[PDB]
Design a binder for this molecule. Structure first.
Ligand SMILES: Nc1c(C(=O)NCc2ccc(C(=O)N[C@@H](CCC3CCCCC3)C(=O)N3CCNCC3)cc2)cnn1-c1ccccc1
Length: 336
């Protein structure tokens, strides 16, 4: 039974089920067209995102479908999930707007740290949750690709979720992406986690580059010029020359960069900030690292159901993407 909707303005107009009350814009553009609301069904505050021009073009329609598919798939404590999705339309013919309802978080990870060191216990808890969510995301063959403190949100009980509010900042970007090395694996996200973890411990950005070149120079000063093993995997002579032109010395010992830090934290940072992404620790491996002994539970670090992203390879018409999106709205099943 279709609930009754009500309209509102909010310089953006919102038609939502009566279920959602007390709507108010939040983030003022940083979050998009997002309002906080009171979910009368559960008595919890929620976030309502209205999609912008979802079916204006093939690209818009496919992006709308993609985001709905991703959100419908993510069912994990440390990843943003879909509480509801709705449209005022009563038919595919009238279908032109999509609203996504998620949990409302309280702050991102810039708001928690505020340029001050966190305790080592608190860093364990925060990074453990990030890695727990990444193990889940990566098990579905999904790569975040833009992990950074602003895409990590917490509530008052310090419970953390991974989202994507999106390039804005390069401070957390893996060197292989910056170098256009083309073959990326999931540990580009592990690089970002390493940068975040270092920042939580020290209160300082690990690699605060002024521009693209400076960012790579700062990275390579810490992690060193490519070793012989990594150089063997670089096809292009110009590519080999270019990376060496930005570097010089071997890597530094992280034990003499993170003075006063838990030696287990330093060991983990070493394994996350490896230049060769083939040698970089995975999320599942990192969760078993002794640094997380007080939080690690091998039986509550779940993986995702298989995620069918064969649609990514397809060239469909605008009405086909729209119909596929409409079918995914209809088939949605709320959580418990
Ligand atoms: N602003 C918000 C919200 C909110 O916007 N919720 C709506 C809300 C919808 C959607 C998303 C979201 O992340 N959507 C992803 C798909 C899921 C991703 C989860 C991780 C792994 C990779 C996939 C996506 O496809 N796109 C399209 C391209 N650009 C980026 C987003 C976030 C959020 C929820 N809480 N808060 C909040 C309030 C105060 C302080 C801090 C946060």
């Amino acid at each position: 039974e279709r609930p009754t909707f009500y309209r509102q303005e909010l310089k953006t107009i919102w038609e939502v089920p009566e279920r959602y009350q007390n709507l108010s814009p939040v983030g003022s553009g940083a979050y998009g067209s997002v309002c906080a609301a009171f979910d009368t069904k559960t008595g919890h505050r929620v976030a309502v995102k209205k999609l912008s021009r979802p079916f204006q073009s093939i690209i818009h329609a496919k992006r709308t479908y993609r985001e709905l598919r991703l959100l419908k798939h993510m069912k994990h404590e440390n990843v943003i999930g879909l509480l509801d999705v709705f449209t005022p339309a009563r038919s595919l013919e009238e279908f032109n707007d999509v609203y996504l309802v998620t949990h409302l978080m309280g702050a991102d990870l810039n708001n928690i740290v505020k340029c001050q060191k966190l305790t080592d216990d608190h860093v364990q808890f925060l990074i453990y949750q990030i890695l727990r969510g990444l193990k889940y995301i990566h098990s579905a063959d999904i790569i975040h690709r833009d992990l950074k403190p602003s895409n990590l949100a917490v509530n008052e009980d310090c419970e953390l979720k991974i989202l994507d509010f999106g390039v804005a900042t390069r401070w957390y970007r893996a060197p292989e992406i910056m170098l256009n090395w083309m073959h990326y694996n999931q540990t580009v996200d592990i690089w970002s986690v390493g940068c975040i973890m270092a920042e939580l411990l020290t209160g300082r950005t690990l690699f605060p580059g002024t521009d693209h070149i400076d960012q790579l120079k700062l990275i390579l000063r810490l992690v060193g010029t490519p070793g012989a093993e990594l150089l063997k995997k670089i096809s292009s002579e110009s590519a080999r020359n270019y990376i060496q032109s930005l570097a010089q010395m071997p890597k530094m010992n992280f034990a003499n960069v993170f003075i006063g830090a838990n030696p287990l934290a330093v060991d983990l940072l070493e394994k996350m900030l490896v230049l060769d992404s083939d040698k970089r620790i995975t999320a599942a491996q990192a969760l078993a690292h002794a640094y997380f002994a007080q939080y690690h539970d091998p039986d509550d670090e779940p993986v995702a159901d298989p995620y069918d992203q064969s649609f990514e390879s397809r060239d469909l018409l605008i009405d086909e993407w729209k119909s596929l999106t409409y079918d995914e709205v209809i088939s949605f099943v709320p959580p418990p």
